[PDB]
Amino acid sequence: AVWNYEFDTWSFRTIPYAQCIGLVDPPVLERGPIWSDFQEITWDDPSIKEL
Amino acid sequence: SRGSQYILTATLSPANAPNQNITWTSSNPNIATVSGTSTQGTINALLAGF
Amino acid sequence: ETNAVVITDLNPLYPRDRDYIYEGAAQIRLIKQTLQNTFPNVTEPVDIDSDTFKIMSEKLKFTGDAMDVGGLMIKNVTPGTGDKDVVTKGQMEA
Amino acid sequence: ETNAVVITDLNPLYPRDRDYIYEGAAQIRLIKQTLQNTFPNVTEPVDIDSDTFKIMSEKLKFTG
Numbered sequence: 001a002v003w004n005y006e007f008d009t010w011s012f013r014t015i016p017y018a019q020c021i022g023l024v025d026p027p028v029l030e031r032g033p034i035w036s037d038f039q040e041i042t043w044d045d046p047s048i049k050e051l
Numbered sequence: 052s053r054g055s056q057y058i059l060t061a062t063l064s065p066a067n068a069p070n071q072n073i074t075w076t077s078s079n080p081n082i083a084t085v086s087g088t089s090t091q092g093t094i095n096a097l098l099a100g101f
Numbered sequence: 102e103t104n105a106v107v108i109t110d111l112n113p114l115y116p117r118d119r120d121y122i123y124e125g126a127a128q129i130r131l132i133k134q135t136l137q138n139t140f141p142n143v144t145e146p147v148d149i150d151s152d153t154f155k156i157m158s159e160k161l162k163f164t165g166d167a168m169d170v171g172g173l174m175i176k177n178v179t180p181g182t183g184d185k186d187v188v189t190k191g192q193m194e195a
Numbered sequence: 196e197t198n199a200v201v202i203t204d205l206n207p208l209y210p211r212d213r214d215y216i217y218e219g220a221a222q223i224r225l226i227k228q229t230l231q232n233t234f235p236n237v238t239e240p241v242d243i244d245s246d247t248f249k250i251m252s253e254k255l256k257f258t259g
Contacts, residue, residue: 035212038122039057053104055127098104126212129222134207136226143203143233151236158241163251 053098059091102127108139201225203233 002011025031029048041048061073075085082100085091102124103111111131116124152158162168175184198209199221210218234240253259 033216034214035126035210035216035218036058036123040121042121043116043118052102052124054131055102055124057123123212125219126210129226130207130210130212132226133205136230137205137207140233147203147233147235149234149236151234151238152240152242154236158239161242162244163247 052095054095056092056094059093061089061091063089103131106131106134106138108135110135199225201229203229205229 002013003009004011028037029051063071073086073088075087075091077083077085082096083094085093103115105111116128152161160169176182177184198206198211199218201209202225205226210222
């Protein structure tokens with residue numbers, strides 16, 4: 001049940017079975033990658049498509 | 052391939068080394084040249100030749 | 102990746118959909134340098150011509166004889182061809 | 196530092212491959228916009244006929 005403390009409104013949503021939660025920086029592939037980093041990656045989405 | 056230059060990394064055995072420096076060498080540098088530090092950045096000139 | 106600098110130099114299918122992604126920058130750079138060197142004089146406005154937009158893509162031929170004779174008007178300025186009136190007056194005057 | 200702003204004239208060495216990934220579809224859109232603006236009317240511009248410009252290099256000298 002999410003509440004916005006800037007406009008005082010209530011809303012709900014679903015989460016993927018969270019035992020915990022926190023904030024952290026993402027992996028290098030999502031922390032800002034570089035063209036000359038995908039030296040081993042190819043267009044055959046080797047287990048990575050959501051980019 | 053032609054023009055493509057892939058970057059190579061050299062991780063020294065010890066986690067750290069003071070006053071360390073690398074001077075990359077390759078026989079007949081006319082085919083390619085590399086230097087600096089652990090980061091190589093190999094450049095390719097021809098389409099064949101090991 | 103090709104080592105050419107001009108058009109019609111690399112198969113669009115050369116990436117294979119399997120090549121490594123680190124070559125994309127080299128492909129974009131190649132494309133840009135090709136577009137730059139194939140039209141180095143394009144600096145004025147776009148100046149769209151599209152080859153007359155209608156038919157000149159095939160009719161514009163010059164192999165052993167020219168065609169599409171110009172339909173210019175009179176050349177009272179910059180006297181060139183022998184305009185009929187002028188030559189007639191000159192001949193009748195002598 | 197943002198180098199993804201170019202029109203009618205591009206630069207091949209500005210991308211500086213060792214750069215963030217935002218450089219990409221942005222440059223592709225730029226190339227497409229430049230190509231469209233330069234010639235926004237294209238069906239089949241085949242007015243070359245196997246490099247006729249070489250023998251027909253008389254376009255710049257309309258005197259002779």
